[PDB]
Amino acid sequence: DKTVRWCAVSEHEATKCQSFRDHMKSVIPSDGPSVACVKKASYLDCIRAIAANEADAVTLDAGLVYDAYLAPNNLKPVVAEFYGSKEDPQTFYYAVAVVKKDSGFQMNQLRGKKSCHTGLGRSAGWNIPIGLLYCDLPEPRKPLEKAVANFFSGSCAPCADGTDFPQLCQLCPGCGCSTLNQYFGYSGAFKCLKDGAGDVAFVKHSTIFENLANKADRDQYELLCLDNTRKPVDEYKDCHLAQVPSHTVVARSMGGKEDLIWELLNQAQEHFGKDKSKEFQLFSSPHGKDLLFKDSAHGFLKVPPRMDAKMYLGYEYVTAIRNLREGTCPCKPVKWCALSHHERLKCDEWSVNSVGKIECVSAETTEDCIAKIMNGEADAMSLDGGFVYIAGKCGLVPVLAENYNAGYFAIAVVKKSASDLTWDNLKGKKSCHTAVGRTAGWNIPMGLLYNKINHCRFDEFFSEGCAPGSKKDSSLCKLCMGSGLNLCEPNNKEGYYGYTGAFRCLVEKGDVAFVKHQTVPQNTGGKNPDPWAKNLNEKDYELLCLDGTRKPVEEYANCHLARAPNHAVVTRKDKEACVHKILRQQQHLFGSNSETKDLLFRDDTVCLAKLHDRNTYEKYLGEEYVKAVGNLRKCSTSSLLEACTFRRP
Numbered sequence: 001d002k003t004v005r006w007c008a009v010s011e012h013e014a015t016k017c018q019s020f021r022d023h024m025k026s027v028i029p030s031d032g033p034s035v036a037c038v039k040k041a042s043y044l045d046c047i048r049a050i051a052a053n054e055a056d057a058v059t060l061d062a063g064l065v066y067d068a069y070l071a072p073n074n075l076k077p078v079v080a081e082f083y084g085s086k087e088d089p090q091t092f093y094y095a096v097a098v099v100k101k102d103s104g105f106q107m108n109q110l111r112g113k114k115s116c117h118t119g120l121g122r123s124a125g126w127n128i129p130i131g132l133l134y135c136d137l138p139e140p141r142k143p144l145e146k147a148v149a150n151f152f153s154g155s156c157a158p159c160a161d162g163t164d165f166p167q168l169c170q171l172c173p174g175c176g177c178s179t180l181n182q183y184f185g186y187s188g189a190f191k192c193l194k195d196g197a198g199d200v201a202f203v204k205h206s207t208i209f210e211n212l213a214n215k216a217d218r219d220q221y222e223l224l225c226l227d228n229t230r231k232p233v234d235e236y237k238d239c240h241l242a243q244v245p246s247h248t249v250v251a252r253s254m255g256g257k258e259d260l261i262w263e264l265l266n267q268a269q270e271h272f273g274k275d276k277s278k279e280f281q282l283f284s285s286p287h288g289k290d291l292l293f294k295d296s297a298h299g300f301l302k303v304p305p306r307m308d309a310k311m312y313l314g315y316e317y318v319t320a321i322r323n324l325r326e327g328t329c330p331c332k333p334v335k336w337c338a339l340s341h342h343e344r345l346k347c348d349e350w351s352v353n354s355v356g357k358i359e360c361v362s363a364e365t366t367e368d369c370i371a372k373i374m375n376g377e378a379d380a381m382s383l384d385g386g387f388v389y390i391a392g393k394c395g396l397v398p399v400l401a402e403n404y405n406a407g408y409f410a411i412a413v414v415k416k417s418a419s420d421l422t423w424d425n426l427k428g429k430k431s432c433h434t435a436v437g438r439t440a441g442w443n444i445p446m447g448l449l450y451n452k453i454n455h456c457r458f459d460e461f462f463s464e465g466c467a468p469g470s471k472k473d474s475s476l477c478k479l480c481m482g483s484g485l486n487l488c489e490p491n492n493k494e495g496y497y498g499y500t501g502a503f504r505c506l507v508e509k510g511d512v513a514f515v516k517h518q519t520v521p522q523n524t525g526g527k528n529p530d531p532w533a534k535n536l537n538e539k540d541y542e543l544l545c546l547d548g549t550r551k552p553v554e555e556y557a558n559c560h561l562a563r564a565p566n567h568a569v570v571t572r573k574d575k576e577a578c579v580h581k582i583l584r585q586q587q588h589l590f591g592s593n594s595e596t597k598d599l600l601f602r603d604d605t606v607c608l609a610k611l612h613d614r615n616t617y618e619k620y621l622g623e624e625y626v627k628a629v630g631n632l633r634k635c636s637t638s639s640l641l642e643a644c645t646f647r648r649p
């Protein structure tokens with residue numbers, strides 16, 4: 001059977017679920033998904049049922065999505081309710097901290113201020129703010145209301161115990177837990193700020209726009225960011241305390257049945273969704289409100305499959321809630337991300353030589369490493385410019401660049417014999433790329449080549465090639481040299497992967513190689529002893545310049561496609577300051593003063609530079625690069641980038 005066992009937490013939810021079940025059978029062919037209605041006492045019993053393989057799916061709030069993920073349940077998000085409507089599906093809400101312009105403080109200065117909360121136990125209003133501020137709270141931090149009452153000088157915390165902690169109702173005496181209180185609710189908390197009662201209001205990114213219709217009024221307010229700066233209120237996407245998902249269907253991490261759950265719900269919304277006018281309505285019921293799904297929902301979106309819970313909730317939210325539940329308070333060692341066996345051992349004795357200042361975490365892919373940096377499992381790692389872009393869209397920032405001497409050059413290399421080749425028409429020719437998605441091998445070359453054909457389906461412009469990372473059936477995987485599962489894979493077990501592998505690809509079967517400027521010289525004249533390169537001379541190879549001419553290899557300065565942003569270290573903004581510092585020390589202690597090739601960093605790197613003002617993926621790579629990458633993402637297959645862009649379209 002292709003049955004999805006849906007978990008209800010009430011008799012009304014069960015009744016609607018049974019109706020859901022019956023109407024599906026009139027709509028879905030017998031070879032398709034069906035529904036079964038398991039009923040439990042609570043969302044946690046549902047979570048446990050799903051993990052115990054007694055049910056498959058339930059819809060939860062962000063707090064429960066965290067519970068569902070914790071061991072031993074290990075559930076993940078698979079489908080997302082969206083709101084607003086089809087044009088612009090709203091899946092998340094942002095918890096923000098609104099303040100008045102020129103009030104002169106930031107998040108790390110909230111102690112002593114007057115606070116406005118939507119209500120005790122509420123999320124944007126209480127749980128999130130308090131969870132981020134937890135370790136700033138005075139001890140003892142239990143009971144939490146007492147700690148909060150000894151942190152802000154006075155507050156309006158609706159439904160707080162004003163009798164034992166009157167500070168929490170100074171701005172709304174009695175702490176009224178109803179709209180009878182003027183400072184209650186999302187709109188009430190903002191009023192507490194607007195009226196001058198308080199200095200900050202913990203609400204949602206939308207509260208302000210729903211209570212002030214004119215931009216002139218809104219310009220008198222700002223948001224507190226966690227980097228201890230401020231931004232305007234229409235920039236909440238870059239200045240919030242947490243990005244929270246409104247309503248999320250969860251399922252087993254292994255054992256699914258993600259694919260059926262989506263097929264079921266996708267066809268459910270197509271026949272019974274918003275404004276479908278049937279006897280049965282997926283987003284309402286006469287039996288009660290918000291059964292199975294929120295009544296205000298407009299449809300379902302499929303959660304990208306790379307997404308796990310910690311990634312879907314986000315670093316900030318997870319930090320907040322984790323603090324409230326564990327209650328554990330503390331520059332601490334940098335946890336570096338290693339991608340392979342050889343990289344790991346190099347890291348391991350970097351950790352021993354460091355006397356603790358650097359620990360080592362290992363993952364199997366770069367994107368798995370970035371995911372660990374995002375969610376806290378790891379801290380830093382060095383990345384090609386094409387991966388810092390991905391790391392940027394995912395919320396990370398660059399802390400340091402690799403200097404080898406403005407960075408390295410992206411050159412297109414050709415065999416001198418074949419002298420018909422010019423940059424102006426390589427159409428129908430054999431191409432060699434380091435890997436799809438990287439500066440020299442793809443982003444720059446295919447960036448420029450995107451402008452002159454107006455599309456990124458490059459397996460049709462070129463005849464064939466090796467671009468490790470393309471779908472293994474593509475014409476840009478036919479020249480690759482890996483055997484078995486390694487054919488065309490973007491790692492070492494594909495011989496044509498990397499700067500030099502792409503040049504080897506040119507030597508043995510390609511017509512042009514997109515590569516850095518030091519690659520040909522460093523792999524010719526016997527400098528590389530492996531048979532394929534040992535007897536090569538760099539004079540047999542030329543570079544294609546953009547004007548349309550050709551030029552020898554060692555005068556790349558006048559014959560390059562563009563300047564390439566240097567590789568860079570990336571981390572979370574909440575560790576930018578400490579990763580910079582740890583590393584620079586570890587550099588004049590182990591710098592220019594890898595056992596195989598280029599572990600952790602490229603060994604030709606001489607020092608790690610700081611960027612001053614270019615600590616953003618947009619300001620480090622430059623506008624013309626991100627514009628190019630933006631054009632090539634249309635044809636990109638990066639599952640991690642698909643997850644991060646789901647959170648930030």
Ligand SMILES: [Fe+3]
Nearest residue numbers: 122123124125
């Ligand atoms: Fe709420």
Ligand SMILES: [Fe+3]
Nearest residue numbers: 384385439440
């Ligand atoms: Fe690179």
